[PDB]
Structure 1
Amino acid sequence: TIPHLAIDPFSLDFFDDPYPDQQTLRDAGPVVYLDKWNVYGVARYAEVHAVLNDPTTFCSSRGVGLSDFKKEKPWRPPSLILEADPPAHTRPRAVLSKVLSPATMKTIRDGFAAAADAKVDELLQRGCIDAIADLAEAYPLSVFPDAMGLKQEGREHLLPYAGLVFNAFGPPNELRQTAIERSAPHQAYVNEQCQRPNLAPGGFGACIHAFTDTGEITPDEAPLLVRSLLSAGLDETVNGIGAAVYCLARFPGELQRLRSDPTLARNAFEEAVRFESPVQTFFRTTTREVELGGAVIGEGEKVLMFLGSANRDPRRWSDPDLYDITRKTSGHVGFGSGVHMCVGQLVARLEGEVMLSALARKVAAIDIDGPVKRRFNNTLRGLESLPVKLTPA
């Protein structure tokens, strides 16, 4: 009843161009079986959304990667929020929801916006830049580690550790094995910065430790919660920003619309998150026999969700392959959906908005003027290099 496909969604061929195989996965049926890794797959919006919003049946505590924590040892101590189910997930989630809250965004928005304007002004003096290294990577690195309260030394570990985390969600392929092989120095840095004395007052990390006297988390839980904010947030925001720049370069009519109304900056970034989906895939594990899409999935089975495919499903989106900064993007699963829906989404939207705002006000044209190179990751989609010429407005 369930079609079996040999598509490897973690192969370099798939990463280079996933969209034809994603239609093949969508059109084969609501539920497929991937023989390469012995997992179930769902690539349509309806089933991805249904799985995300049933955390009791499709749990996260057995891992959101390929590895089943009931069968294998996690490569690092499990996250207290990402790899936890209700009710254990609830109170750590509440703390992070209060640390990265709407009220907290008010305290950081002016400095985030000023740094975005300053970076665009700096890049416009150079003219020809790499929109990945010099913009998509440089800007988050210029605001987020300071907002965390991290010291200056050792920040070069942040990008490798982020890429390692997302590669480790993948299958035991070469990308995952080499990442873990080189991981020891990055883990040692990250774990040490999670201790309370190493987090500057007023920052995100110090605020997490401050919640330890409320009864929501204990002091021994705070280091691992800080680790969450040093694992997530960087690479996805970098890829989302680089994707927005790539789209404004490939779709010049949308840059012109954004220039004419810079208040479209926030939705322009949200559409880039849907269009690119920096987090392409992750897993759930069934806790019981479940009926999904006419399929009887047994207990203890890994289910692979294709977030980027769900965000391009023509059953849900009109013209899904078009970048439209005025599209009604509400309902996209680029940040997930349900109880685990990205708790840092306000930080990501703030960074993306103020960067696209600076571009909208200061830049007249964005033209690719060099070879575009893709960055390969088991979980993340994004570019490695995006040579562009920025024309001042």
Structure 2
Amino acid sequence: VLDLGALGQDFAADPYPTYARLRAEGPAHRVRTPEGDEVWLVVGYDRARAVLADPRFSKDWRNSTTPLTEAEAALNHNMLESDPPRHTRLRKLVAREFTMRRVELLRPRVQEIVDGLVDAMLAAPDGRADLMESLAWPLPITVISELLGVPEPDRAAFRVWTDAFVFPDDPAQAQTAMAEMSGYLSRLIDSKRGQDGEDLLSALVRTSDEDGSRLTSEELLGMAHILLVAGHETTVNLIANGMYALLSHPDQLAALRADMTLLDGAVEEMLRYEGPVESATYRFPVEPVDLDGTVIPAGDTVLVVLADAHRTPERFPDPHRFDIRRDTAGHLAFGHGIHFCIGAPLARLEARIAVRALLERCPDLALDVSPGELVWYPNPMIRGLKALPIRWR
């Protein structure tokens, strides 16, 4: 057991060395994370990539000796927290809507907005702004709302909840926050019902209404949840981490400056260097697994430490180097195997459109700050700044 709350923000800020340390000793290690939780950590690209889609590791709480709370299980009815089948019926209901193709239509809007967002920000006399409260957050929370059909006056309560889940002032807010969403969202599910809305949510109400055997009132809720969430506190951070990455390394930022074709590649490398997902989501071996000696026993929670997998000197030699030339082919910033991210299509869309914006409508764009002044979330699942200021001139 290696405590993580005790390691400090230092770990948060730069936990890569520890990951190194860990991998060098073995594939798996039981550790305590910042919130009293005593979990497992899988490290190393080779060992991790395997785990992610290894049958033996379940994502269904029933294969977990760790109990859920009313707040919890009232929402775990999502494709992501289900194993096959089920995860087959659920994901096979939104698939057709998140394909690279379909998704591309959303573009003009993931355009219309990334400009409006950029405009208010450019309304800084001083020249300074915290990209986080300007782009990063705003963007992701708009597109999805305008998709799962989320009223404007409520797109705020969400940033409120997402926070408490990420790193709550105290491991209690989250349990209350879950109630809210679980409630605001159920109340939302009704507004739709009856109306003739065309958004994805409305679209998911007629499916439960018609045949609740295809989608349950619970899975509908589950669904609505995992879609809003599982892509809000991930996109936002890729955005920020992406800017802190591209702003810190001038050789590249200048490269991508003159040439803007390295954009589609800039993003893929902003996910290999430091993507928003520090570690995969909870996995439970249905039966005791044997990762060469280290034996995680039944029901135990597991986390694939992506951030380390993504820094394997054997697949990304010179790991700690951020080269938008680098061959990002092989990164697991989106997961792998059946549970792979159903949003990579949508995600990238927003990202690339964004960097282009900020780089094309922000002259002397630069870090209006120093590393020593950053602040990263302690959670070992995420990896993002609490805020990130910039200046343009």
TM range (shorter): 0.7 to 0.9
Q: Which residue of 2 aligns with 1:325?
A: 324
- Alpha-carbon distance in structure 2 between the residues aligned to 1:189 and 1:72: 21
Q: Is the 8 A contact 2:161 2:177 kept in 1?
A: no
Look up the equivalent residue of 1:51 and give its one-letter code: V
Q: Which residue of 2 aligns with 1:381?
A: 383
Segments of structure 1 that go 5 or more residues without pairing to the other structure are 169-173
Deviations 1:196-232 (A, max 9, x none): 6179833232333355558983352323211221222
Q: Which residue of 2 aligns with 1:144?
A: 144
Q: Which residue of 2 aligns with 1:44?
A: 44
Q: How far did 1:264 drift?
A: 2.5
Q: How far did 1:113 drift?
A: 1.8
- Alpha-carbon distance in structure 2 between the residues aligned to 1:195 and 1:15: 41
Q: CA distance change for structure 1 residues 185 and 34 in 2, over 3 Å: closer, same or farther?
A: closer
Q: Which residue of 2 aligns with 1:350?
A: 349
1:209 paired to 2:205:
yes
Q: Matched residues, percent identical?
A: 29
- Alpha-carbon distance in structure 2 between the residues aligned to 1:373 and 1:25: 25
> 265-274 or 345-354, which moves further after superposition?
265-274
1:267 paired to 2:265:
yes
Q: Which residue of 2 aligns with 1:251?
A: 249
Q: How far did 1:104 drift?
A: 2.4
* TM-score computed with the length of structure 1 as normaliser: 0.86
Q: How far did 1:180 drift?
A: 2.3
Give the 3-state SS of the residue equivalent to 1:385 in structure 2: coil
> 347-356 or 283-292, which moves further after superposition?
283-292
> 276-285 or 291-300, which moves further after superposition?
291-300
> 80-89 or 125-134, which moves further after superposition?
125-134
Q: CA distance change for structure 1 residues 94 and 182 in 2, over 3 Å: closer, same or farther?
A: closer
Q: Is the 8 A contact 1:263 1:357 kept in 2?
A: no
Q: CA distance change for structure 1 residues 166 and 341 in 2, over 3 Å: closer, same or farther?
A: farther
1:27 paired to 2:24:
yes
- Alpha-carbon distance in structure 2 between the residues aligned to 1:278 and 1:251: 19
Q: How far did 1:363 drift?
A: 3.2
Give the 3-state SS of the residue equivalent to 1:41 in structure 2: strand
Q: How far did 1:10 drift?
A: 8.6
- Alpha-carbon distance in structure 2 between the residues aligned to 1:299 and 1:149: 40
Give the 3-state SS of the residue equivalent to 1:293 in structure 2: coil
Q: Is the 8 A contact 1:96 1:208 kept in 2?
A: no
Q: Which residue of 2 aligns with 1:171?
A: none
Look up the equivalent residue of 1:20 and give its one-letter code: P
- Alpha-carbon distance in structure 1 between the residues aligned to 2:105 and 2:268: 22
Structural mapping, 1:80-91, within 5 Å: 80-91=78-89
Q: Is the 8 A contact 1:280 1:306 kept in 2?
A: yes
- Alpha-carbon distance in structure 2 between the residues aligned to 1:325 and 1:227: 34
Q: How far did 1:92 drift?
A: 0.3
Q: CA distance change for structure 1 residues 35 and 114 in 2, over 3 Å: closer, same or farther?
A: closer
Q: How far did 1:347 drift?
A: 1.3
Q: CA distance change for structure 1 residues 63 and 325 in 2, over 3 Å: closer, same or farther?
A: farther
* TM-score computed with the length of structure 2 as normaliser: 0.86
- Alpha-carbon distance in structure 2 between the residues aligned to 1:86 and 1:182: 29
Q: CA distance change for structure 1 residues 38 and 135 in 2, over 3 Å: closer, same or farther?
A: closer
Deviations 1:239-258 (A, max 9, x none): 11011111121012222222
Q: How far did 1:57 drift?
A: 0.3
Aligned length: 378
Q: How far did 1:31 drift?
A: 2.0
- Alpha-carbon distance in structure 2 between the residues aligned to 1:200 and 1:353: 34
Q: CA distance change for structure 1 residues 167 and 190 in 2, over 3 Å: closer, same or farther?
A: farther
Give the 3-state SS of the residue equivalent to 1:226 in structure 2: helix
Q: Is the 8 A contact 1:136 1:238 kept in 2?
A: yes
Q: How far did 1:165 drift?
A: 4.0
Q: CA distance change for structure 1 residues 228 and 63 in 2, over 3 Å: closer, same or farther?
A: farther
- 1 or 2, which has the higher strand percentage? 1
Q: Which residue of 1 aligns with 2:112?
A: 114
Segments of structure 2 that go 5 or more residues without pairing to the other structure are none
Look up the equivalent residue of 2:174 and give its one-letter code: A
> 200-209 or 123-132, which moves further after superposition?
200-209
1:189 paired to 2:187:
no
Q: CA distance change for structure 1 residues 148 and 50 in 2, over 3 Å: closer, same or farther?
A: same
- Alpha-carbon distance in structure 2 between the residues aligned to 1:251 and 1:110: 30
Deviations 1:263-322 (A, max 9, x none): 322321222122222121232111112222343333222222211111112222122112
Q: Which residue of 1 aligns with 2:15?
A: 18
Q: CA distance change for structure 1 residues 210 and 261 in 2, over 3 Å: closer, same or farther?
A: farther
